[PDB]
Nucleic acid binder design. Structure first.
Ligand SMILES: *C(=O)[C@H](Cc1ccccc1)NC(=O)[C@H](CCSC)NC=O
Length: 271
RNA sequence: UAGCUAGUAGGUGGGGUAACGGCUCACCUAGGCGACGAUCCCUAGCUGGUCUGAGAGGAUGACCAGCCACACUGGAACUGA
RNA sequence: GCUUGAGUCUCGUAGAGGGGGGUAGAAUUCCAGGUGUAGCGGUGAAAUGCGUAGAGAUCUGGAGGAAUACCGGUGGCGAAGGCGGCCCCCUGGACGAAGACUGACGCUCAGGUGCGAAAGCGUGGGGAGCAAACAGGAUUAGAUACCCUGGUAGUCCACGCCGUAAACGAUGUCGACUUGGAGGUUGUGCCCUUGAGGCGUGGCUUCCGGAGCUAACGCGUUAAGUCGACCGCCUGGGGAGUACGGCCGCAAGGUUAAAACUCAAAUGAAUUGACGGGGGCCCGCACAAGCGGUGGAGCAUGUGGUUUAAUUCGAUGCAACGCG
RNA sequence: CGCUUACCACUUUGUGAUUCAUGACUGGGGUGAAGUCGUAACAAGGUAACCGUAGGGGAACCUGCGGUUGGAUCACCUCCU
RNA sequence: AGGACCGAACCGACUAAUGUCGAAAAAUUAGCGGAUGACUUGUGGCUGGGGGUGAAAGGCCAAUCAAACCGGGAGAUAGCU
RNA sequence: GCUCGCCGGAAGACCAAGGGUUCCUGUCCAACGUUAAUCGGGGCAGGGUGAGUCGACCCCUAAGGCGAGGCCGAAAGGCGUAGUCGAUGGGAAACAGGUUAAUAUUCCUGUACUUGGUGUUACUGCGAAGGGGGGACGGAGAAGGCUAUGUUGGCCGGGCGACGGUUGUCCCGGUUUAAGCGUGUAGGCUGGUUUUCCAGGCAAAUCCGGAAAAUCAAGGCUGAGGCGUGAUGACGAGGCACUACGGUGCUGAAGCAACAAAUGCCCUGCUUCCAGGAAAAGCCUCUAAGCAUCAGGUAACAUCAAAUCGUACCCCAAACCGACACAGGUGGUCAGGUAGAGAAUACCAAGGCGCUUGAGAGAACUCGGGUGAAGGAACUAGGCAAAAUGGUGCCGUAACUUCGGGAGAAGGCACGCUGAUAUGUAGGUGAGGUCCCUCGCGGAUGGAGCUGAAAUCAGUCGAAGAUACCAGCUGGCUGCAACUGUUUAUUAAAAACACAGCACUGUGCAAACACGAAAGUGGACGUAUACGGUGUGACGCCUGCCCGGUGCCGGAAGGUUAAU
RNA sequence: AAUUCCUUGUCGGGUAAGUUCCGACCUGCACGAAUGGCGUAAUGAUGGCCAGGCUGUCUCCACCCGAGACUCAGUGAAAUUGAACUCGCUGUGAAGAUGCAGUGUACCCGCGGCAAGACGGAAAGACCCCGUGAACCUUUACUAUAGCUUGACACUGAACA
RNA sequence: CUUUAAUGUUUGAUGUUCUAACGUUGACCCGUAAUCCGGGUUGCGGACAGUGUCUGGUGGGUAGUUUGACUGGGGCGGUC
RNA sequence: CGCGGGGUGGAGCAGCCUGGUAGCUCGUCGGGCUCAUAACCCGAAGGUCGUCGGUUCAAAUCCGGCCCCCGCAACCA
RNA sequence: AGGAGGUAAAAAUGUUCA
RNA sequence: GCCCGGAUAGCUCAGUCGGUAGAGCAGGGGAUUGAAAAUCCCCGUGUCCUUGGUUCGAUUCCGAGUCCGGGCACCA
C-alpha cells in the first residue's frame, strides 16, 4: 500500500506511508515480550564506538523463534504483527500442543494458514526443514551456517536466497548481495520470501522522522577542523585530500575483507 | 467570446407620460435570454440607389432624395403645439 | 393499419474477438558436478573481448524471463489499433435455417464520451535474450556511422497517464441499382451417398478485366460506375501545422489555430532520352592465356615549366605531346 | 427665497482586464550571381526511403522500437525417374 | 493529521537604548523567534585530558580550553627585562 | 489606629530540594543593616519540632555501580556470571473540627481503616529460589456524565441611613459539612457455563494455553458523582458578657433550590494513526522435592503490636545557588469576582506589601516618557529608533504555483446604549403532574422555573462606539539557502551546520568499523529492502571531455628484492 | 555574478540627479555541471533596491511630567600619584615645554559646568621585527612508531600423487 | 656453447585426504533455579586459522624536531 | 653504489635471443590514380646505427671498458 | 517440372548564364 | 618612472654564422573563359622608431631619447 500524502505542510509533501491493514491493531503478546534497552552506541568503557546512534522511540523486544525446532507439529498462524526492531512483519503462530510463538512472516501468508516445522512438511511458504530435503532451486529465507545456530541469512523484508546447487554434503546459495557460499547441507531453511517487502518504497520525509528511528545527525567530514577529521581544515570549501574515514583508512575502494578462515566457503564473490 | 441579467422576467397596488409599459418605487413569485449564437470585442450611419456583372451575386452608400443621430466635451431642465 | 427498413425469440456453426488463472515443449543465458585440452569467439580482413585460475566443446541437473517451430494459407476474427502452443471459467460480435412477433423503434451526426500500434512517462516488481545512451577495437581524409565484442533504460506483468503513426485498400458512413470469369473461406437446400460428388441459394475475401468514369495511372458488384442522405475538411508554395491565448497533460508536448513577409512557382500522372556500385542477352587484345616492349640507363624528337632583348602562333581528356 | 434630502456629470483613491505604439536585447524565419565543412535525399544514392517517438552528435544526419510502400532485383551453381 | 498558523506559560536570544569602578564578572526596559515537537524540564547515572562530547564554532568539559584543574619533576630554561 | 498607593496565574497560601534554629518570647544597641533605631534574619538567656495511617527507612526493580568463583592484563587493575545495591518508578491503611507565643492529616474531641504475632471455635489438605494471571503503561483528538468553584433567588439576621431620594424590583453579611460504610448508577470491558482429552508451559500441575461436544442466554468485572449515613453533632453571622483593654468564657437562627462550569475526576477509558509505546515485587491461583492423629490454610471472635529517623522556619527568596540584606536563576500543587477567546490584560477579593537613606530646589546636561505648528527620510552607512497599522462578523482578494497555498493578500461595510420583534427569541438545562414496567439512582409524555447568543428595525448622545490595557505595517524587484530546526554560553544566529532525498564504496556474521595492551563489548539480541564510511543536500530538467599524475581494484610472466 | 583587476565597462528602465538596484550585451583578470550546474511555489528575527502609509529621524528644535544632576543632614568609597609655590606666547631642546631663555600677563581661595592639554588613567602593544622562544595545524620536510600487510622459524602432524 | 628428452638425485613449493594439535561468539548434559566460565559427549572446519620472535613494504593515524644569515624595518630578488 | 634495461633518418619505432637486409609509417619533391581535385598505392633523399678498442670471411646485433638517460634497494666523513 | 544452402571491398567533389 | 615585447611597403605581419631585405591582400596588367569565378605570373610595393660604435659590411651584438602592453608596487 504505497500511500502518498498530500502537501498540506512543509516536509509533509514527501512522506510516503506504507500501510498494512491486515496487521493486528491491538497490543502485542505479553508472554513473548521482554524489555530491550537502548544503548546510544556505547560499550563497556562508555565511549561512543558507533556514531549516529541515540534518542529514538522506546521499543520492546518481541522474542522471535528462529530455530524452528518444534519437530513435526502442525501450527496455525493466529495473526500478523508489527515488529519495531526489525524490517519484517512477524506472525503469531499457535501449535497443536497449545503453544504460541513468533516466526518471521513469509510472503505468501494470511491469518488462518497452517504450517509445520520438520523434515516432513510440504514445499510451501512458511514451512521449515533441513536443506538436504528441499528441491535444488527453491527459494528460502532465515537460513543458517551452523546446524542449529538459529537462522542468520535472509532475515529482512523481501529477502530470499536461492539454493543453486548441491555438492556433496554442502549447499550452494546465491545470496542477496550476489554471493555463492557453500553452507552445511543439514542447516535449516524456511521456504518462501519474507513479506512486508514494500519497506523499500518508504520515504521518511522529515529530519525528525529519522530522529525517532534513532538516527542522530551525521556531520560531514569537510565541515570540521583538522583535529576532528582527516578531511577538515580548509579556508572555504576545498577538499584536496584522498577520501578517508575518521580514522585514516581510505574509503571508496578498499576491500577490507580479512578473515581467511572462511575463504574456503566463498565459491564466487560479490560482483 | 460560453454562459449572461438582479428593477433584471412577470404579477399586484400607487404614481408618472400627450399615450401603453419597470417608465418608476414597495411587496410577492424565481424566473427571463441562449448553439436556427445570448453577452463580449472590433468595425460601421441605414436605404432608395451607384458601379460592375449575361444572370445570380460581389463591392459600395460621394453628388440628388427619405430617415436616424450630433452640433467644444458631458450632465440636467425650462420656454413652447 | 400494413410491409419489402430495422429490432427481438427458438436450434446450431466457424473463428489468433476480449479478460482472468494454471500448464507444457524447444531454445538462449547463468550456476554446480564429472569428462577433457589449447585454443574459443568474430569478420571483407583484423582486433577488442574470453582462456592453462583451466574456457569453448560434451553429459547430467537446476534456475528463471521472454517468445510460441511445423500447422500457417493474398487463411480467420475484430470497428480500428490489433489478435495466434494447450486447457478451464467469464463474456462480446457476426452468420445460416424453417417460421413467428413488434410495426419505421431508421440513418447520419458539430459539441460530448470511450477505445486507441509503437515510442515515451509516473508508482511498483521482474529482468533471459535483444538492445537507445555509453565503453572498446576497427574503418577512415574525419566516424561522436554503417562492421564487431560488451552494455543502463527499455522491450514483459499489475494500476494510472500519454492520445500520437505512410493509424494507408493514402479511398468517411448507410442504402439501391449496374455484363462475367478464375480461386480461397463458412453455413445450407435437393438429387442416386449410386465413388475423390452434381445443380441452386446467402455472408466474407483474392486476382483479372467489360460498361462507364478518370488528367493518367488504374478502380471496376468490397468501385474512383450511376444516385440519394448527413458529417469532417480543402481554396498556390514556403512561412507553418509555426506564434499568442485557451483547453488537456506530472513531464515530454498534444489539440484548436494566424499574421507580416517572400516567391510565381510548388504539385501529380505519364512519355522520349540519359544515368544507376539495377537486372537479362550479345560483342571487342576488354579481361582471361601468352610474347615483346614502356616506366629504370644514355640518346634522338616534341610538350609543359623556367628563362630570354625573341626564345613566333596553334593544338594541350580518350580525340595534345616524331602534331601542324 | 434661504436651508435641506434623493437624483447626478467633471474628478480623486485602490485593485483587475484588454489593447496600441515604444523598448536595450534576443530566438527562429524569409531573402541574397559565383565563401566554409561534409555529402543526407534522388538509381538498390553505395547502411533502402519515409512517417511516428526517445536519446545522441560541429552540420546534414545516426541508433533503437513499431508501421507503410511513396523500395530495386530475382539470374546463376551443388541434389531427384 | 500536521517538525501546520496566531499567540501566554516555558525555552531561546535578532534590534536599539541603558549599564560599563553596573543592580548584575552578559543583566534591565521596550519590541522580537519557537511555542504538539529534531519540544522543554526535574531527579539519578555514564563518557575525561592528546582524552571525552560536539546538528561541527577548533565551540564545551565547574566564570579557566588550538589541549582543563591540583600536586610533583622544579629553584625547568631565559644569549631577554 | 485612620485615610492612601502597589501585586493579585503574584510581590498570595503550601511541599521537594537546599540551608541549618534564621521560627517564638524577654531583653540589650558597641559591632552587623550602606542613615537614625527602644527595630530586625544582630548579641545574650529561655522556649519550641509529639505520627500504626505524611515522607524516608522498609519489600521490589530501571539507567547504572560493585561483584564469590571466572576470564584477561608487567603490578595496580579491567570486564563480568550467580548474586547484591540503586528511585525520579511499583507496593497496606485517616478525615473534619478545636487548641499554641511558636507544632499538628502528629496532641485533644468525634467518627473509621490497614497489615502481622498469639490464642479460641468450626471446617478444610497445605506446601517453593518453579509455572501462569495480574501489576503493566504510547501520541493525538472529540464527546458525554459530574465535581471543585461561582452567580442568582428563597430563607435568617442587622440597617432604613451625617447633601437631594431609599419599607422597597432596596442595602450588607451568612447560607459550611470530610474519610469510612451501604446501594452499584451514567458509561466502559468481556459472551458466560458444564464435560472429555492433549507431542505445550527446563519436572509436575485441577492454574494458564489448545482441540471438539453440550446448555442458556446473559452472567461477571470496573466505576467518578449522587442519594442515605457520618451529623436531633461540629462549625456558624450576630449577641450575651469580663478586659492585663492583646483576647477569654457562654450561647448561637438560616444552613435549601436553580443555573453556569473546568486544564480536576470517570480516563490505568473510547476512536484513530503510527515512530509501536519499563521491569520486578505486593496480590490471586496450581503444584514439585515433601509433610498428613500433624504442620499450615479459609472464616468469625478476643487481645497485643505497628518499631527508628525527619517533623520547628524559609522554599520564585535579606535564610537556596550568585563574595553582599544583589533589579539574575530555582522543579511541583491550589489559583476566586467583572469584562475578555484566554492562565493575555485592566481593576479588585482572600492574603501580603510601600521594595531600609530622607527633606528641600525645580539650572545646564543625562536617563525614562507625553505633545507639537509647515514639510514628511531632505537625516543617515541604512527609515536605527520612535510613529503608525492592530479585534470580531460579512463582502471581496493578483502574478505565480508543487494546485496545499500565495492569503488575514490588498482593500472596504457594520460595531456603543435603550426599546421593540419577544412584560429576554433560537437554543441549553429542567421540577411537579400522568402512564407503564423485567420496580430502580428507570424510561416516555410533560412543561413551571432558571440561564441566555446573535440578527433586524426604530430612537438617541458624543469629535471618536475594536473608544482603556491588549492588539499585524502593507505591497513590488531580486541574491542566497528548500522548509521546522542547530550553532560561536559571554562582540558573529548567517548564505554556515543539519536535513529527508540521490550516488559511489566497504561488509556474508567470529561482518565491516570503533573502545580496549587483552578479555570483552558497542555494531545488534540487527544480519544486504541491513549496517559503516564519504560526498552532495527538497523538488524539476540534467550531470559533458580526460586514466598522464595520485589513490584504489585486478593480472602478474620478467628485473630488482629483507630475514633465512 | 557572494565570482569582472581594468571600471563608477556599455545600453535600456527607475531619479531632477543613481559607484548601489533591476533587465540585457559577452571583453568569463580568474563561472561551470554531486568540492554539482541552471530554474523553483512556500518559508526567512537573512543581503541589496523601490513605493505607499506614517511620524521630531531631519529642516530647527520648543515645552512639559517624573528619576538623578544642585542645596541641607547621616553614612561614606574608587581608579591614580616622584616632589610642587601647577600661566600664555616665540624660540631652544632625546627634535610637540606648566618647570629652560626672552617676553607679555596674572590680587588669595571655592562652587557649578564643558573636555584642548597634562604625548591624561586602565592593559610590561595583540601591529612590525628580534629570540638559533613556545604552542598547536599541514604535507610527496627528516627520523621514528600504532595499525594493516609479506616471508622464514616455533605452536605444527600423517599420508600417497 | 644454444637448444632439449627420459631417468636418478637435491630442494622450493602445490593438489588431495585423514584425525589426534588447535579453533569452535554450533547442539546436548552436568557443576546449577545462572545467555559468563570450566569439563565431558558430538558435529563442522583443520595443520590452515590465530599468536610469539626475526624481517620487507605502506604508514601525518600518533610523537619528537628543523625549516640560515646579511638586509638603509621585514618578505621577495641578490649575496655568502 | 652495483645487479637490470634502453640510445637508430628531422621526430617517433621494428629488426637484439639466430650475426650477412639499414628498414615500416607522419611530415616534404615527384610518378602515377581519375576527364580533373582529393584519396589510397609506390620509388627514391636523409641516420659517424652514442664514442673508442676489438674477436670473425663479414657487425646495430654477440663481445670489453667507459660518457649520457630512468626504476629500484641502497649511502653514518 | 516443384523448392531450399552459397553469391563482390573503396568511388566524397564539379562555381553563374545560355 | 622601473623590470620586460615590438615599430618593416597602402594595411596586417615574417627574419639569431653579422651578408645590401620577403608574405598575403589592397591597385594595375597578363595568361584565363563566350562573358565571369577560381588560380598563377609580373610590378610599384623600403632611413628596418630615432640616434651611436667596431667592422669588408649593421635589422641583427650591445648603449641611450620616443611610442605601445603585461607585471615587481608586499603587511602595518
Ligand atoms: C595596523 O593596522 C595595526 C593593527 C592593529 C589594529 C588594532 C589594534 C592593534 C593593532 N594598527 C595599530 O597598531 C593601531 C594604529 C593604527 S595606525 C595605521 N594601534 C592601536 O593601538
Amino acid at each position: 500500500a504505497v500511500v502518498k500524502c498530500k502537501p498540506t505542510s512543509p516536509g509533509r509533501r514527501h512522506v510516503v506511508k506504507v500501510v498494512n491493514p491486515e496487521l493486528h491493531k491491538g497490543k502485542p503478546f505479553a508472554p513473548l515480550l521482554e524489555k530491550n534497552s537502548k544503548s546510544g552506541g556505547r560499550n563497556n568503557n562508555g565511549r561512543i564506538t558507533t556514531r549516529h546512534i541515540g534518542g529514538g522511540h522506546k521499543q520492546a523486544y518481541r522474542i522471535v523463534d528462529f530455530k524452528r525446532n518444534k519437530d513435526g507439529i502442525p501450527a496455525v498462524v493466529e495473526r500478523l504483527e508489527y515488529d519495531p526492531n526489525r524490517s519484517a512483519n512477524i506472525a503469531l503462530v499457535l501449535y497443536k500442543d497449545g503453544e504460541r510463538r513468533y516466526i518471521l512472516a513469509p510472503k505468501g501468508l494470511k491469518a488462518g494458514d497452517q504450517i509445520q516445522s520438520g523434515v516432513d512438511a510440504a514445499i510451501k511458504p512458511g514451512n521449515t526443514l533441513p536443506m538436504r530435503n528441499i528441491p535444488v532451486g527453491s527459494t528460502v529465507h532465515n537460513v543458517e551456517m551452523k546446524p542449529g545456530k538459529g537462522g542468520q541469512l535472509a532475515r529482512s523484508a523481501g529477502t530470499y536466497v536461492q539454493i543453486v546447487a548441491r555438492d556433496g554434503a554442502y549447499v550452494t546459495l546465491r545470496l542477496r548481495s550476489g554471493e555463492m557460499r557453500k553452507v552445511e547441507a543439514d542447516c535449516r531453511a524456511t521456504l518462501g520470501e519474507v513479506g512486508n517487502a514494500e519497506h523499500m518504497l518508504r520515504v521518511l520525509g522529515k529530519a525528525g522522522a529519522a530522529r525517532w528511528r534513532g538516527v542522530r545527525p551525521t556531520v560531514r567530514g569537510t565541515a570540521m577542523n583538522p583535529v576532528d577529521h582527516p578531511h577538515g581544515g580548509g579556508e572555504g570549501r576545498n577538499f584536496g585530500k584522498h577520501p578517508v574515514t575518521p580514522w585514516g583508512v581510505q574509503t571508496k575502494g578498499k576491500k577490507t575483507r580479512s578473515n581467511k578462515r572462511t575463504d574456503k566457503f566463498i565459491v564466487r564473490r560479490r560482483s
